Amino acid sequence: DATVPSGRPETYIWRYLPAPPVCIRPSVMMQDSPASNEDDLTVKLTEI
Amino acid sequence: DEINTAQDKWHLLPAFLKVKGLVKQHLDSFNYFVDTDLKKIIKANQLILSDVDPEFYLKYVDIRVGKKSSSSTKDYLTPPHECRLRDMTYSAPIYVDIEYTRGRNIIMHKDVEIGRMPIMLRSNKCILYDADESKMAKLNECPLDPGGYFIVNGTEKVILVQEQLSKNRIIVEADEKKGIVQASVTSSTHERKSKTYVITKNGKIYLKHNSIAEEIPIAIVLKACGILSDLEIMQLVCGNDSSYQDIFAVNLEESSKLDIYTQQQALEYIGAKVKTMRRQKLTILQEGIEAIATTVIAHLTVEALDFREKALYIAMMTRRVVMAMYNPKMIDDRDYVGNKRLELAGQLISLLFEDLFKKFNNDFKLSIDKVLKKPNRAMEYDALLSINVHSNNITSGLNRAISTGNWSLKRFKMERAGVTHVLSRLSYISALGMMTRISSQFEKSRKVSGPRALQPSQFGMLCTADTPEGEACGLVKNLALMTHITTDDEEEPIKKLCYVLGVEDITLIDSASLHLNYGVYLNGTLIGSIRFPTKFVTQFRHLRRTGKVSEFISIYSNSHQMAVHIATDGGRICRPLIIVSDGQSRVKDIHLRKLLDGELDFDDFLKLGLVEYLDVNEENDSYIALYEKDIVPSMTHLEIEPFTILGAVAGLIPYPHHNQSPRNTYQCAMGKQAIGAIAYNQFKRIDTLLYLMTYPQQPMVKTKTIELIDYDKLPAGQNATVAVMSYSGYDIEDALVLNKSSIDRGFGRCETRRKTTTVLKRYANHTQDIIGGMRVDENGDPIWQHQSLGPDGLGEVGMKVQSGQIYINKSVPTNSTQYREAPVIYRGPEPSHIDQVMMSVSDNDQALIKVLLRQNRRPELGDKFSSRHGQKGVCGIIVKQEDMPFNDQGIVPDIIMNPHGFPSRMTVGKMIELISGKAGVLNGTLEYGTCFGGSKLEDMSKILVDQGFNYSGKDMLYSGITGECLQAYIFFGPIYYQKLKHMVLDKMHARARGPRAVLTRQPTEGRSRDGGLRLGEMERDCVIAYGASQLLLERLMISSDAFEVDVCDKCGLMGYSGWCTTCKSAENIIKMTIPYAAKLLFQELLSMNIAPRLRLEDIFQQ
Amino acid sequence: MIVPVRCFSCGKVVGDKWESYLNLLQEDELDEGTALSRLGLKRYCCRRMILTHVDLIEKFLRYNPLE
Ligand SMILES: [Zn+2]
Ligand SMILES: [Zn+2]
């Protein structure tokens, strides 16, 4: 349904990545190394 | 009194256990490894060469563990208990002799240490070997410890015995609506493969290998293996039987349907389908590639121009297929005990060390190439500095594999886990039963109960009662009391013997007559045929009884499949039987008299041919008598003692043959959790958790097994005075009535000891943690947090620690000069007492503090007890002694157990135990409840009557609360009761509010972290079925995750601070409460390209 | 470990009979039943208190850390 914007099919191709909020992908504190440990999603978006 | 063969042949069991202990599979496997398998690995990987500098080589000459040639004594090993205390590894160094060439033509030996070998306890290399309990006391070791495990980084790890299907044997399996496949998982010394062998359609037989692209027609492969007459193919795989001819003839047509064949044509066909070899030796891609395809199709490597051996192997493969085609039930049970092998810790470690040494050699040669790639001044002197450096990887990987249980083997290429487990220290029987435990192969499709059922073929090999509960029911198995695991014997000394005994080699036999006489198979391989298979088998068994061949080699004949089978491989479970000849047993109690007097140990019964080991397969050819009185003139063997069909743990049960089997299995479970005595050095031990009974008693009714395993030396339980009666109504449903003032006098009194370990670790900035502290108040007294802390900052031995107090005052540097407090705080509902503070260092020069916290425990309401018969229960009520029923002498039961637990569970063994224990206490003698035996009930009744008690153990009691005679006679007597490790003090949990997982903003998951209880899908469904919408809301949002989100009414997107931050207006933002799980899921959906816009309406306005 | 002071069921003092029981068994050896009866342990609860005791404290004392 193209009544509303974003109903265009071209919005269904990955152009913008909505990087999630920090609370969605928490970074643990003092894990192994005194340094904070990040997580899989943050690592993947860094690589992207 | 003269020896009677019937009731005195059981002494063969203590004789056998004297030299072949319960923990002997591990011990023999490790001893064989460190004595010969190390030599074999060193000789296989003996010479690493370099492409550069041909006038240079490195030769591994000898390998030795823990001993040098400088002195006759061995090297000083850190004692295993010191390793346990210091959190290090009980290991001995590996030494090799190195022949490395010098630049000036110098030949020399050496004694080079290339790493550390984690030593099994009580092995040949262990310091506890043949220690006389005085050396054991000096080394702080219990003389009753099983041994057979490893101490890696202070942790006792046991490499569990592994079940697997036998390799290099044909297994035929059928199916419904799929067809018939039969496989041969063939494992060579360096490559493992499964020559799978399937039928596709039209009764057409195909060969399906991993390397081959598509399944090859069987006639093609049979012609490729030299068998190319195409009438002998059908003669070999069908013989003279008309049915098999018709079943097999279809795939003779497809042999010519493509084109008629020579050997080399089928060779080229099969070689066309080879997949790849990582693109090395590409110029072999011709008819020559089929040669490697066929030679690496199985374990029958062909090293000449004759293919008859592999050809006949494939032919019998096909013939088994064809018999299964003609009828099912010609397949073989995959759960048959004879079709499984037991691999042991020595074999595991041998293969792991092979991989580690291969890696070590590869990296050493890389270092050699890097050193010798320099053009000039390539001095040779001290070419072993690198080996001094590089020895750490062998030690590191060898320790890590045992510590973690994960075994990453690159050469063989599987990743298996759970090889090792932390040794159980709940009880002495817990440790002993953790040894002799077997884990079965995974990937089994646990949805079925196939490899879960008890098989009759495990009789006397695997305990029929010691199986776990819950999830590993029938998968984890245990060794029977009197068993042996065969070792590998070389088969070429005995193929020659088979030829001597009349076997004609398959190279002298024609195909037409092959199925006319019996074939002879050596480890699954048809080596020849023979006339008179019965006479051949008899001659072989005589030759083994006279010691001319290994007593572990098994010979048996198959009538349905015309085949005499000889097995020499290791991993086969076997047990000794008395040989019965001509209707008579061969022991005849002159040997028993000699055995008891001191001569003729168990091995001499094998040397004289009185006993012999039988594996599961020879038992098919045997006919065993259970007893002497049923020796009929057709029986081949006689049971040494039939109660050995139960394991070590199941031997704790008195009169198990009088119980329902689930009760015996449940007692096998409970005895491992019973609280008792751990070891003679249990107060020297500092374990993570240790429950100890204050006043353990040996059972009044014991068995032969418990005295064979020395359970009466470290018993876990007490002989409670028990009245079996309904009482007080607090004993319904397994619940027990415990006597107050029996608890007061120490009945069921135990304690728990818990260790906490902290390391003062040094840091790269040359800083480290410290344990300074113990700040005082102005009056001089320490603050309450430091009441029991001592000047050194470590809690004082003997002092009580309440919850919140510090017993390790550790300070951590803030730039790991300034120290932030990280003290170890006691978090316990009940106070503990510091009973031990150990200060030491580890092998890596780092401070190590271990504090032992002990805590006395009174049996309270809800604590669990059991009675050796699967009758467990919690304390329902604790009653005053004067409220208890009493007998004429004033005897008051310690425990009252409900009679309602008996009729449905049918633990008659428990009643017999009560009567036998009562007779034993009145007579002064400990009674026996041995399986299939024990003390007769009538003799116990005679003792009871002769002492003035009722023959059936029922006494007239008076009520303790009314004083009147109870109208029924009460079953009254002693029963051994075990207090189990499940105390309500460690189970009582209650959370109001507290820690939350930040990701989901929900309460945490564990009683340790003060977590909440999960209201799952099923509870939600129950609440829905009640129709309680508000309770649903309160439990699943209000009391779990209630987030006050901001929702824009225009676009259903969540905002913050009443701000749409997408419409940037804040006019349409409204406020509502949703689960934080819903908030998180919406935000995660927005992370993908899914926008779950919320549409909102007013609750009101009707 | 060490012999309990009192019988769990009766409360009768049995901790003063362990040594006399051991010496009855060793010196001028008696059967266990008659040794128990000679010490006054008449009731079967007090009998099992001594009959089933495992003297583990002697084994524990072999590892004395304050030699
Ligand atoms: Zn909006
Ligand atoms: Zn008493």
UniProtKB/Swiss-Prot annotation, chain A:
It is found in: Nucleus. It comes from the Eukaryota. Present with 6020 molecules/cell in log phase SD medium. DNA-dependent RNA polymerase catalyzes the transcription of DNA into RNA using the four ribonucleoside triphosphates as substrates. Largest and catalytic core component of RNA polymerase III which synthesizes small RNAs, such as 5S rRNA and tRNAs. Forms the polymerase active center together with the second largest subunit. A single-stranded DNA template strand of the promoter is positioned within the central active site cleft of Pol III. Component of the RNA polymerase III (Pol III) complex consisting of 17 subunits. Belongs to the RNA polymerase beta' chain family. This is DNA-directed RNA polymerase III subunit RPC1. It comes from Saccharomyces cerevisiae (strain ATCC 204508 / S288c) (Baker's yeast). The lineage of its organism: Eukaryota, Fungi, Dikarya, Ascomycota, Saccharomycotina. The chain holds residues 245 to 292 of 1460 of the full protein.
From Swiss-Prot, chain B:
A zinc finger (C4-type) spans 1048-1063. One of its GO terms (biological process) is termination of RNA polymerase III transcription. It is found in: Nucleus. Zn(2+) binds at residues 1048, 1051, 1060, 1063. The keyword Cell inner membrane does not apply. It catalyses: RNA(n) + a ribonucleoside 5'-triphosphate = RNA(n+1) + diphosphate. Its EC number is 2.7.7.6. Its main location: nucleus. Keywords: DNA-directed RNA polymerase, Metal-binding, Nucleotidyltransferase, Nucleus, Transcription, Transferase, Zinc, Zinc-finger. One of its GO terms (molecular function) is ribonucleoside binding. One of its GO terms (cellular component) is mitochondrion. It comes from the Eukaryota. It is an enzyme of class 2 (transferase). Present with 1950 molecules/cell in log phase SD medium. Belongs to the RNA polymerase beta chain family. NCBIfam families: PRK09606.1. DNA-dependent RNA polymerase catalyzes the transcription of DNA into RNA using the four ribonucleoside triphosphates as substrates. Second largest core component of RNA polymerase III which synthesizes small RNAs, such as 5S rRNA and tRNAs. Proposed to contribute to the polymerase catalytic activity and forms the polymerase active center together with the largest subunit. Pol III is composed of mobile elements and RPC2 is part of the core element with the central large cleft and probably a clamp element that moves to open and close the cleft. Component of the RNA polymerase III (Pol III) complex consisting of 17 subunits. This is DNA-directed RNA polymerase III subunit RPC2. It comes from Saccharomyces cerevisiae (strain ATCC 204508 / S288c). The lineage of its organism: Eukaryota, Fungi, Dikarya, Ascomycota, Saccharomycotina.
From Swiss-Prot, chain C:
There is a cross-link at residue 59 (Glycyl lysine isopeptide (Lys-Gly) (interchain with G-Cter in ubiquitin)). SUPFAM superfamilies: RNA polymerase subunit RPB10. GO terms for biological process: nucleolar large rRNA transcription by RNA polymerase I; ribosome biogenesis; RNA-templated transcription; termination of RNA polymerase I transcription; termination of RNA polymerase III transcription; transcription by RNA polymerase I; transcription by RNA polymerase II; transcription by RNA polymerase III. Gene3D superfamilies: Homeodomain-like (1.10.10.60). Zn(2+) binds at residues 7, 10, 45-46. It holds the Pfam family RNA_pol_N. Keywords: DNA-directed RNA polymerase, Isopeptide bond, Metal-binding, Nucleus, Ribosome biogenesis, Transcription, Ubl conjugation, Zinc. GO terms for molecular function: DNA binding; DNA-directed RNA polymerase activity; zinc ion binding. The keyword Transcription applies. It comes from the Eukaryota. The keyword Calcium does not apply. InterPro entries: RNA_pol_su_RPB10, RNA_pol_suN_Zn-BS, RPABC5/Rpb10. Component of the RNA polymerase I (Pol I), RNA polymerase II (Pol II) and RNA polymerase III (Pol III) complexes. Component of the RNA polymerase I (Pol I) complex consisting of 14 subunits: RPA135, RPA190, RPC40, RPA14, RPB5, RPO26, RPA43, RPB8, RPA12, RPB10, RPC19, RPC10, RPA49 and RPA34. The complex is composed of a horseshoe-shaped core containing ten subunits (RPA135, RPA190, RPB5, RPO26, RPB8, RPB10, RPC10, RPA12, RPC19 and RPC40) where RPA135 and RPA190 form the DNA-binding cleft. Belongs to the archaeal Rpo10/eukaryotic RPB10 RNA polymerase subunit family. Present with 5300 molecules/cell in log phase SD medium. This is DNA-directed RNA polymerases I, II, and III subunit RPABC5. It comes from Saccharomyces cerevisiae (strain ATCC 204508 / S288c) (Baker's yeast).
